[PDB]
């Protein structure tokens, strides 16, 4: 798959990308001289943990186009922007490794954090690698970088060999943490990037990210290997955390630069916990959004208070005897049978422990729709469309083009297991039907 | 509630009707000069016994319109037709009392028995009250009826008094079988009917129903009070049973014309047993047809023997513990999940008492059409057509034009109470599905 | 007239209601086994006293539909809710008699007192008729109620006779307080209710209203006959007042259950004093409400003080010489001609005696809508709508959808006697106009 | 080139495919973890032998998309279906290797053999690799497969190395049958497949194909290497042939799993001979179909008998002196000149030895069409379309949209060498013209 980010002479500039899984979107930004595929150990874990995984190849690398233009962090950040806007990513996590950490800082800084829930920096460039008078903690002098450029231009192929040596601490990790075959794959990936991009990339490494850091708005994770030969932890991660004290901070003991493979475990575990925290917050936000829509249907009073409390408790994972919950709902006076069905539906969907409880007649009767075939026809049409949705908003939006009667019947289809849909899409459906009903009052 | 049956000058002609309970529809057609409310003792019993009770007021009576037109049995039968078609009554029982027995005969005769499961005649006019040369068993000469008309026109109010006397055998039954207050209510009801209808009604009483009787297609009950002063049992019920030997026949010893109140018991008991028996008999026949189709899907062996025995036992009306039945089915080895779903479905449909058992997950999963939207789309289309069917063969026939996947999903739709059809149509659906599956093997 | 409250099978459930008089709305809720018409002695008094009288027939009674469903106080209260919402009743008084007192408590309790100014309980069920361990003051054991049900099912017609005996204390009151004809009417009314409702009603009588009582928010009146044989004053009214000490409380010495007829006087006098207090307050509010809107258009200063004082004096009923008032207004400096017209209009409307004063040119010129035909067209359209309004708020609401120019012209139309509306509707019109004008400033 | 088979989140699922050569379509379905390019030794032979070669990359492999969904044989078979339908393949041969043999069985089984002339199974999975109680001949227990999955997830790169070892019997074949460079290419191909697909693939290997096998309708070839370490010939090919006795069956002595490369020769030779047989069978079928169309034109009688016999003899390759044949035809009484032309045309087309015989005047006169330019115009238009056809049916179908006159003229164009078309397309043309003529009679 490709996203077009610009034009070079007669040709467009296209970025290779992939889009896997369902749930909260997590965007992985690779390092030099590798591609989106270098995240494979992390992607698998994220997929299993229940996230939507987005990867892409930076211009000049992997399967992306290989222009001789736009090798700088503003362009790279603009490239990223195009991806985020193209996919309409909301509430996204940005994870950068090495070079990728430059994108994360520069994007956040320039474009802000409207689409962004959290950020993570792994084997970071930050805050400023160039050793100057005003930057004493800098890792190397300018002459040093000039050297790498010269080395890549001389023989990039041979260059990759010595680079992956220190990249992976092969003298320590070969035949242990990393196989010879895994290293072979990395060299092949690098050899496949553009000649021009290879030599141009190292000039972007001493970009000054010092003014980007105060812009970091959202929860952040900083993660570095203490055995990093490529980006000395002392000139990078350690001075970066001083600049961003608020960042959650993890040192990987004796981990090299290429810690994504050698220490995938330690990497995935830190990432997943941080992500789980962020995911929980996202779930809470969704619940509040779902809760507000659900409550909009209920007449104001003490009953509305009880229901809200129950919703909140189930959402917080505390309430859980569905059989007791459903009986309570069933026996509530004043509540409309339809509103009882909607709540019935919501509780069975959100409660963790459904156990072995059969579906409820009172809900079935409330949602089914009087048995009008025209109504049922439209509910089936909606269901067909919802089956293709993966987001709450997309689901909610298409649902709003249907009548309240067709919507309730559609909910019944799902409730009765006659059709099946993801929880977040089911939420969107429910909320559209609540909105329609509330709006009619 | 009203149903419009026609137009008189600037005004429409509306029939007052009521629609109570759930289950098999039973239509009660009142006598002169009373209304649908005169059935109150019978309605209560039928409601308790688990029937859907429909009553209406004949034109010119009770709360119906009071035109000066359409006082004849073809119009009265056409009126009834409009009611049946308006409500889309399927598999209905028609019960007539006195005048009402004229509707039953004439409707059946002219319009046929497509919607009609059984008929009942209480205190019947049949076969022909007019005493002629060709009708020797006739109850009275023409001059006698001419007399009643003249009497009603003279003072209908005073007339009702002497009429209810003989109607109820008040000289015997007052303060005993019937209260003075109950009689007062009857007079009030009569006084409330239209003046024109009161005088016009008695001209319809010597309608010749002799050619209607051979048309009676379906199981019938004939019931008469031996103390009937209004319709002599000897000129009516007794010669009627000769004309329809096949009719089930009940004499109420010393019961008057107004036996609905005075002998409600004896009335309700005969009615309820007949009501019960008809469904079972036809139900038994249907079960025996269905069993062969159902068994055709099961592999030969001892298990097939157990299932057949269970089918036969539920079909023969041994009320089985559905919960125990369903668990047994669920835990059967070798049986395909789909076959288990079909049997699961059949057992819940045929078992006398579901006892408020929640629907079963194993059946729902088996009959979900794989959650395929195309299957579900076709299942909904089939359902639309099945909604218009009233017979096992018609239902089975249209079902055979659909794929096994769409058929199973359709069964799921019904099982989940997302749609509804009559039991016999449901049988046709299950048998088409069984035929399709068996045929694939 | 009917209000639809639900659906039973193929038929809707409609409540018969009436809507008489003008002024503060008073809703009368009848007792068993009677109808809205049983309030006729009270309605006449309320109409003469200047109230808007709303009556309706409970489901299963009088001219309402006769379903075999919804015989319970939550449904009855929901029925009432539908009526109140359908008519958009504001600032309403709820008066219940016997069974009706159950509606009042349950509605107030569940739905709250937003539309409700005051409540009255006459011959109350409250707080809990069932005699139990936890309810010692209960009037009878469960077996006793079971008995009534059995009696009604046996012969409701005969039952009504003995019931009205004790209902009215006929052994005391016949030929004295109540005529034989009045009693005959009551029996006829009862005999006309639904058979099913008659037997189902007595099961609702031992509803526990104990948790409803603390919810009673608004001023209340409790009224009971000390000779009540149907609802013993000692198990009802007397323990009810303990539960609601705040309630105004009236014992009618030797009055039976059916005190609405036998003691209409004592009943109407207590009711009218309490209501009169409430009505006076409402009148004051209306004048005060009008006054605030009227004053909002006048610039702050000593003149605004004089005007306010004059308004208050005419509102308080000091009959003012309109001629003197109008001349004063006319000659006021600083006051806009339009504002003078509005005040001119208000004063002629509120002043007790116009004394045959010709309409004023200065007002006519001020309220002519600039003689613009488009304004006049819209003014006529508004007038058409206002002709159908009976309340201040309804009138004010529709008026706000019109421009200030059309509103002023409409006022002119009324001022010139070219059209006519009720005073309260006229008030709404003037206030909408004042609001529009003030809002423009 | 790509064919889209579905959608994953925001991205479509595209299969990489190639389409080479002309003639009968042969579809090659690769094995794990390789791509369509692994067939290169076979493709070259098929291309030289005169077949149309179609290859594609299974989802997750080679150049196809790499979703994290649809890794199962129903999806894989549905993928294949989309390819066949997209290309409108008629009379196709399906050849599967290893994993690919699962597609062949499942497609044939579910979708049937309408487009399919023959099938071939090389290094087959069939009939069921899982060793169970009911499957004793199974190659391994479930725990064994669970192991492979675990191994791939651990390090797929390293895994490929040991896999190709046994895949190729490198201990035997390296430096002999297979070069180190050829093996290097294979590893590169595998490393290029999707990470998720790599680990998911081995779960599809113990798919039960036992119910698919009886569905195999068309001529089949089973081919296995006796030195197969990956799929033991004893648990696969040998028990598979018992299940399909009818299959032509070839053991490659001491050939490994990767016999496509190591034993390309023995592989190509068996394949080509079978393909030739299949082609001959297809030709026989075509000859019989052609014969029926051709005979439909001839009046019944002894002449029709002679002609049929001659057709059959020429079709069976026995009759061959065209000059003698054509003279016989020419001199036949009763035969229409047009029918003589059609037969003349057919015989010159089917006879192997045309020798050096000039085209015949009697045929030319019969087919030319009277020289009407409109007729000729349409014949040229048809010819343009036929030039793009490669199948008998496609040819016959477009021909049927033309008049008999235009069709005969078109036949003349071809007969006169004014245009040129493939034999099978020429057959379709002839048969359309015969059908049209016969249909006119």
mmCIF file of C-alpha atoms in Angstrom, chain D residues 44-45 62 155 168 189 216 236 301 321 326 374 402 434:
data_model
loop_
_atom_site.group_PDB
_atom_site.id
_atom_site.type_symbol
_atom_site.label_atom_id
_atom_site.label_comp_id
_atom_site.label_asym_id
_atom_site.label_seq_id
_atom_site.Cartn_x
_atom_site.Cartn_y
_atom_site.Cartn_z
ATOM 1 C CA UNK D 44 9.579 -22.611 -18.990
ATOM 2 C CA UNK D 45 8.685 -26.174 -20.054
ATOM 3 C CA UNK D 62 6.093 -13.296 -2.277
ATOM 4 C CA UNK D 155 13.024 -16.669 14.708
ATOM 5 C CA UNK D 168 15.610 -29.954 -0.273
ATOM 6 C CA UNK D 189 11.942 -15.344 -1.074
ATOM 7 C CA UNK D 216 -12.818 -34.555 -7.534
ATOM 8 C CA UNK D 236 0.095 -38.457 2.243
ATOM 9 C CA UNK D 301 -30.472 -40.494 -43.740
ATOM 10 C CA UNK D 321 -6.547 -38.000 -47.721
ATOM 11 C CA UNK D 326 -13.219 -33.080 -50.602
ATOM 12 C CA UNK D 374 -23.114 -5.139 -45.663
ATOM 13 C CA UNK D 402 -24.320 -12.310 -35.811
ATOM 14 C CA UNK D 434 -24.387 -24.532 -37.684
#
